[model samples]
Target: VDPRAKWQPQDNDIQACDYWRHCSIDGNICDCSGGSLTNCPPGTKLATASWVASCYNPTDGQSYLIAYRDCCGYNVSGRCPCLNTEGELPVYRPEFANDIIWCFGAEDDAMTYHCTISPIVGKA
Candidate 1:
């Protein structure tokens, strides 16, 4: 099954964030609305503008990153966050969680995520 096809935006849900220190791999503490995958939260900075997420993929071993800015426009209700990946991983394990990926600067146009395997910029 394609992961992107399964994605759907949640407009009614309140803005929340994930706290990985006390979060589960499949826990609901993380806020997808804030563009966090591993529960890094929305207002918090992960060092050097770092933001990360663990996007599960049945065909890949490592999960992809869904990153965004710390504090973007006030009315960022519909504007989804952007992301990038360091590289691709191939290994099927539905029960296995993948690597943690990070992205920064969603407020900028160049930082917009293109969902490509090899992104030219915004790579860490």
Candidate 2:
């Protein structure tokens, strides 16, 4: 029996954020409010800055790079949901800190992280 047998891909509703693709996701599920799987809400701006993770996909038996991009130009949603590092680094590392709000570069100098858009950027 495989020791990691419990890990498996999920086809869950994206609004839940427990879907297989979100293994290393961070921040609120966009769709829970107004955002879609790949878009920000009506008033929010899509942040180019992002927190990245290498999540394992049981369906393909491989790791994929999940970029958790923030929707900026708004205050922190306070919903602030989800955080799955999957072996990512801490604050000292800076580049991989998933807990830090990644809205520094947005228009109006937005400084809060609302929700995240999970996009698979590459194979890992």
Task: Quote the positional error of residue 28 for candidate 1 in Å.
Answer: 15
The residue-by-residue lDDT of candidate 2 on 1-124, one tens digit each, is 3534444446657765457666666778777668877778778877778777777776678887877778877765655366555656878975678777777666777767677887888999
**lDDT (10s digit) by residue, model 1, range 1-124:** 3434534233233222112111112212224444333333454333223333344332333344333223232233333333223222333431222232222443342332221111112222
TM-score per candidate, chains pooled: 0.21, 0.79
Clash pairs for candidate 2: none
- lDDT at 13 for candidate 2? 70
Give the number of the best model, judged by TM-score: 2
Q: Model 2, residue 22: what's the lDDT? A: 67
Clash count list over all predictions: 2, 0
Clashes of 2: 0
User: Candidate 2, which segments miss by more than 4 Å at Cα?
Assistant: 1-9, 78-80
TM-score of 1: 0.21
